[PDB]
Amino acid sequence: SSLASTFCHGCYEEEWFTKQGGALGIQTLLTEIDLGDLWVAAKQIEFVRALMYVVKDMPQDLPEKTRRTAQVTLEQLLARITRNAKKQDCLPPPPPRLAQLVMMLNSELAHMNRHVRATARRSIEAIAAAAQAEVWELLEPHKKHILGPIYAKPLRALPFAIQIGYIDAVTYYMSLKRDFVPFDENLNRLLMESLALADASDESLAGKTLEFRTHDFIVNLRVSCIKILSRAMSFEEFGSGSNNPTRPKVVSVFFKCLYSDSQPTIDAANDALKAVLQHTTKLPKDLLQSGLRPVLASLQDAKRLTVHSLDNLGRLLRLLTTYFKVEIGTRLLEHVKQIADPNFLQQLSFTFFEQNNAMKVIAAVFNIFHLLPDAARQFKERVIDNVLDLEQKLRRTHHSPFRLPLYKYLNKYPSDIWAFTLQKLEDLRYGRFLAQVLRHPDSQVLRDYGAANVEFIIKTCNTVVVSGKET
Amino acid sequence: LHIPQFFLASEATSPSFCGILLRFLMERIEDVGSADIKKSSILLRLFKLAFMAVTLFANQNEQVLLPHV
Numbered sequence: 038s039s040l041a042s043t044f045c046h047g048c049y050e051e052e053w054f055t056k057q058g059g060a061l062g063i064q065t066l067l068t069e070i071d072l073g074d075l076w077v078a079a080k081q082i083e084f085v086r087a088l089m090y091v092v093k094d095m096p097q098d099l100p101e102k103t104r105r106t107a108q109v110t111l112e113q114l115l116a117r118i119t120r121n122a123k124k125q126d127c128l129p130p131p132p133p134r135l136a137q138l139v140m141m142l143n144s145e146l147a148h149m150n151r152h153v154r155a156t157a158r159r160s161i162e163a164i165a166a167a168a169q170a171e172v173w174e175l176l177e178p179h180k181k182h183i184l185g186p187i188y189a190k191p192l193r194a195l196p197f198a199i200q201i202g203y204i205d206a207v208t209y210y211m212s213l214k215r216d217f218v219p220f221d222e223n224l225n226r227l228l229m230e231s232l233a234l235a236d237a238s239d240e241s242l243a244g245k246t247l248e249f250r251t252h253d254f255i256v257n258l259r260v261s262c263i264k265i266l267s268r269a270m271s272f273e274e275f276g277s278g279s280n281n282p283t284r285p286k287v288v289s290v291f292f293k294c295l296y297s298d299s300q301p302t303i304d305a306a307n308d309a310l311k312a313v314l315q316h317t318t319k320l321p322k323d324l325l326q327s328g329l330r331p332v333l334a335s336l337q338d339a340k341r342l343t344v345h346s347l348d349n350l351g352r353l354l355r356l357l358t359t360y361f362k363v364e365i366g367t368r369l370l371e372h373v374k375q376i377a378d379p380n381f382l383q384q385l386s387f388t389f390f391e392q393n394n395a396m397k398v399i400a401a402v403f404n405i406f407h408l409l410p411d412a413a414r415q416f417k418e419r420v421i422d423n424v425l426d427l428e429q430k431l432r433r434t435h436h437s438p439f440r441l442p443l444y445k446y447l448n449k450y451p452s453d454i455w456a457f458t459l460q461k462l463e464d465l466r467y468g469r470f471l472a473q474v475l476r477h478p479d480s481q482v483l484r485d486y487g488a489a490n491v492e493f494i495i496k497t498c499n500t501v502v503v504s505g506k507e508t
Numbered sequence: 509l510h511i512p513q514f515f516l517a518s519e520a521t522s523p524s525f526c527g528i529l530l531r532f533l534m535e536r537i538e539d540v541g542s543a544d545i546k547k548s549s550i551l552l553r554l555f556k557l558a559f560m561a562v563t564l565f566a567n568q569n570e571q572v573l574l575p576h577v
Contacts, residue, residue, distance in 0.1 A: 389524040391531070392575065 041066060041080055048087035048107075049094075056091050057103045063087070064110045067117065078134075081118050085111065085138065089145065093153055108156055115160055119167040127168050127175055135164060143179045147187065147206035149198040154205060173213040180217070183210065188223040192230045197254040204231065204261045208268055220274045228269055235262035236290050260305045263294060267309035271316070285324055288313065292328040296349050303352070310356055325360070329353070336365070339372040347401040354408040363412055369402050370419060382430040390431070391438055399427075400438045407446040414450050417457060425466065435473060444477055451486035459497050463508040509553065516561035526561050527572045529554065534576060 044066065047059025063084055067077070091107040119135070126134040142164075145157040165172045187203045195203075207227065211218045218224060239245035242255055266287050269275045276283035291313070294306035314320070332353055335346040354361060376395055390396055406413060406420060424439050431437065447454050454471075461467040474480055475487070487494065501508070515525045533554060542548050562569040 389527045392527065392572075 041083075045083050045087045048091045053095065053099060053103050056095070057106055060088065060091055060103070060107045060110050064106075064113065067110070067114060077114075077118060081114065082137065082141075084114055085141065088114070089153070089156070092156055093148070093150060104152065111156065111160065112163075115163050119164060122164070122168045124168050124170050124174075127164065127170065129178055135168075139164060139175050140179050140182075143176055144182060146209065147183055147202045149202045151205075154202070154209075158209065171213075173217055176210075176213065177217075180210070184218070188227070192227065193234070197258055200234075201257055201261050204265050208261070208265045211268060215272075220272070228266070228275075231262045231265050232286065232290065235259055235266065235294070256299050256301055259294065259299075260301050263291070263302070263305040263309055266290070267305075267312060270309070270313060285321075288324055289327065295352060296331065298345070307352065307356070314356065325357075336368070339375045342372060342376070342398050342402075344397055344401045347398075347405060351405055351408055354405070359410070361410065363410070366406060366409060366413060366416055369405065370416075370423065373399055373402050373423065377427060377430075379430070382427075386431050396438055400442060403439050404442040404445075407442070407449055414453050417447075417450070417453060420446065421467075421470070425470070444474055444480065447474060448480055448482050451483050454483065455486055455490065459494065462497060462501060509550075509557075512554065512557055516557055517564065519565065522561050522565055523568050523572055526558055526569055529558050530572065530576055533558070 041063075044059050044062035047055050047062065050056060050059075066072070067084075088107045088111045092104055092111075095104050122135065127136060127139055129136045139161070142157050142160050145153055148154055148157075161172060161175070165175055168175075183206055187207065192200055192203065207218070207224075234242075239252075239255055242258075243251070245251060245255065270284070270287060276287075288310075291306050291309050294302050295310065297303060297306075332346070332349050335341070335343070336350065376399060381395070385393060385396070403420070403424070406416060420443065424437075424443055427439065428434070428437050458467055458471045475483060512525070512529065515521050516529075533551070536551060540548055540551055562573050
């Protein structure tokens with residue numbers, strides 16, 4: 038008992054190596070001595086508390102070995118103490134072995150540290166699996182201990198980390214079963230607060246002084262709000278009885294978040310919009326027009342063309358497939374023609390122009406042609422000639438910033454590309470270009486088509502040879 | 509390793525080679541802490557050579573390093 042106490046107290050010291058020693062000592066006592074089952078049953082609560090404290094108290098900018106050690110030891114302990122578990126042992130009496138442990142683990146689901154929440158949910162799932170039960174069955178009695186404190190205070194006044202933890206806890210709770218969290222007034226007020234937070238600007242959120250960590254906090258808060266609103270959108274009771282523009286507002290906020298500069302926000306909004314589009318199967322005209330207006334606004338002038346706007350167009354094309362129209366590619370080609378100046382191109386040579394902004398804009402323009410609808414098969418000659426002329430002006434062979442998007446677009450219509458190339462077998466440029474394309478590691482579709490139609494290739498070549506010309 | 513060093517210490521070729529080398533090294537930066545001494549020594553030496561090249565010609569190579577720091 039004294040040795041166990043020493044190991045458990047080692048976990049609470051402020052030196053990290055002492056914490057690691059404590060966790061390792063607990064592991065050694067668990068998996069190398071076999072002091073018996075009653076002993077572990079009497080030490081389990083202290084062991085769990087000490088390991089969870091080690092997870093809580095480690096600074097997050099040091100190496101992660103100590104936290105991993107604590108988590109592994111916790112996994113082993115939980116595996117040991119649930120050897121012959123049963124549903125009667127985990128739930129409170131109508132004393133149960135694991136009810137106190139379940140309550141203690143539930144109490145840490147809203148912590149301000151994300152690793153703590155991850156560990157707690159992992160442990161709860163591990164316990165539930167061993168008892169052939171559902172998580173909601175175990176967590177129903179202790180739901181108030183989490184829900185009550187969160188609904189007490191206004192969410193706007195709290196620091197960032199506390200808000201993130203609270204929102205994550207509610208989001209996890211409202212996924213266990215369809216009626217776990219009722220749609221009462223408290224939940225509606227919380228959801229409206231989340232919508233307001235997601236729709237706000239960085240300056241309004243305590244100001245963005247360009248500091249790294251404030252920006253990180255704001256991004257994380259936005260991601261959490263987006264996720265909770267997306268989960269709420271899956272319920273038919275949300276926004277229905279209101280009959281007000283709640284769901285349209287959520288969709289507008291999603292679209293606004295899709296056009297942001299932060300990648301995590303873009304990914305979260307992309308997932309939310311994908312789910313909404315899959316579920317709805319239909320879209321009101323006005324809402325989609327409002328969502329599309331900003332994208333079409335920025336594609337009208339070649340002087341203000343940017344990589345960001347073209348990325349937004351690409352994301353929108355990926356989301357709404359059968360909604361766009363042809364004749365935007367022609368406008369993009371005209372913009373490319375305008376941007377590429379013979380004197381500018383002459384000057385650009387002699388330099389490593391991979392870092393030029395105009396070249397990046399042109400590459401972004403070319404990157405859109407493999408996302409356009411199927412009818413974009415009529416631009417193959419135009420784009421191939423454009424790229425070849427651009428490379429000729431820059432005195433480049435085998436390599437340029439424009440090869441990757443062109444290859445991506447060409448690998449989608451192998452039949453058309455092969456027919457076009459075989460129609461021009463008496464020119465060295467086109468054969469050389471197709472051979473160069475085939476040698477890229479990612480041109481497997483074209484390689485398969487060519488391996489299938491070697492017969493037609495040889496037939497056309499033999500026809501040309503038998504014709505008896507100088508070419 | 510003398511070849512990158514020779515290219516980086518010449519006024520004519522230093523900027524373009526520095527750009528190419530930095531672009532290549534940014535894809536490998538994750539191998540620095542590999543615990544294999546042979547793997548990490550070479551990457552560290554290449555990074556140091558690029559930085560020394562930046563120091564040698566400040567009026568030209570600063571803009572090459574700017575988008576990576």
